[PDB]
Amino acid sequence: VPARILDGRRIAEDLLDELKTRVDARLAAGQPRPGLAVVLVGGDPASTVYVRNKRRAAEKVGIEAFDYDLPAGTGEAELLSLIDQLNADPKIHGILVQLPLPGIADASRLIHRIDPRKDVDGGHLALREFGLRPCTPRGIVTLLAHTDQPVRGRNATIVGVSNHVGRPMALELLIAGCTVSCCHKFTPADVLQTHVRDADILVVAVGRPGLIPGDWVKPGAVVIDVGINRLDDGRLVGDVGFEAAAQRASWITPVPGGVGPMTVATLMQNTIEAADAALRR
């Protein structure tokens, strides 16, 4: 695609650096290093990769990763037993169990057994993967700073299903000097089209496939499409027609799919928050 890929990688790296600073400040203050148990059952290739990315993120931050790789065919009973052991171990601050578990379609009883104070994992929109949860309102500017595209003086359009997720992004773009328009899922299609066609910065957070045909995208635009729509046939698409969009945009977010680095980095952040919460009573 002539458009470059605007993905979670650099915002993740930045967050891991910040998290390593926090773990160092904890160790400077005599506190334990946070421990993360990551459980993998079986040898599914994608899962093995996901778990390796988690453990590697953990080591990069200085969290001690305690690895449990268990054979396929391990039953619910043995997993509950393991979980109970991790629950009881004071050096373990967070517990992640990698899904899916071979032969255990419903993982609910296992997930619920994880002590809530160690439940560090705990979605029609890929907000977490792009640092665009409402609780991180500076996210959209951080993401755009990892393009080579100007912000100030440019036209931004935000297409949102809730006023609530769009509002902090609209706001940060206003403060960054953008001329901003907010369109709702109910905005008439012709009006929507007009505002997409004018947008150098396009943020789409609706969760409806096909909402924005790719050819509407302004040449040179930054397209940030966080919808995650599961189609009829299993496939994942965003709210924007990716192939058509990617011939016009200067930067575009990737087709959703898999577990990106920013999600993993946020799991490390949750681990350190859990370890920090445990120093109370």
Query: What is d(CA 233, CA 92) in angstroms, rounded to the nearest whole number?
Result: 40
Is 14 a residue of the active site? no
Residue 155 pairs with which residues in a beta bridge? 179
Q: Which of 54, 200, 225, 239 is catalytic?
A: 54
Residue 245 phi, psi dihedral angles, 5° rounding: -60, -40
Residue 64 phi, psi dihedral angles, 5° rounding: -85, 120
Write out the two tokens for 152.
Answer: 């100030």
73 exposed, middle or buried (CB, 10 Å; 0-12, 13-18, 19+)? Answer: exposed
Query: What is d(CA 270, CA 141) in angstroms, rounded to the nearest whole number?
Result: 22
111 is in an annotated binding site: no
Task: Mention every residue, 6+ apart, whose C-beta is less than 8 A from residue 11.
Answer: 130, 131, 142, 143, 146, 262, 265
Of 113, 32, 47, residue with least CA distance to 80: 113
HSE-up of residue 243 (Cα within 13 Å, Cβ side): 0
Of 225, 188, 218, residue with least CA distance to 203: 225
280: left (phi over 0), alpha (psi -120 to 50) or beta: beta
Alpha carbon of residue 75 to chain centroid: 30
162 is in an annotated binding site: yes
Is 218 a residue of the active site? no
Query: What is d(CA 207, CA 216) in angstroms, rounded to the nearest whole number?
Result: 18
163: left (phi over 0), alpha (psi -120 to 50) or beta: alpha
Q: Which of 98, 149, 200, 218 is catalytic?
A: 98
Q: Which of 67, 89, 121, 276 is catalytic?
A: 121
When computed from its CA atoms, the radius of gyration of the chain, rounded to whole angstroms, is 21
8 is in an annotated binding site: no
250 is in an annotated binding site: no
Is 247 a residue of the active site? no
Binding-site residue ranges? 160-162, 228
Binding-site residue ranges for NADP(+)? 160-162, 228
| Catalytically active residues, by annotation | 54, 98, 121
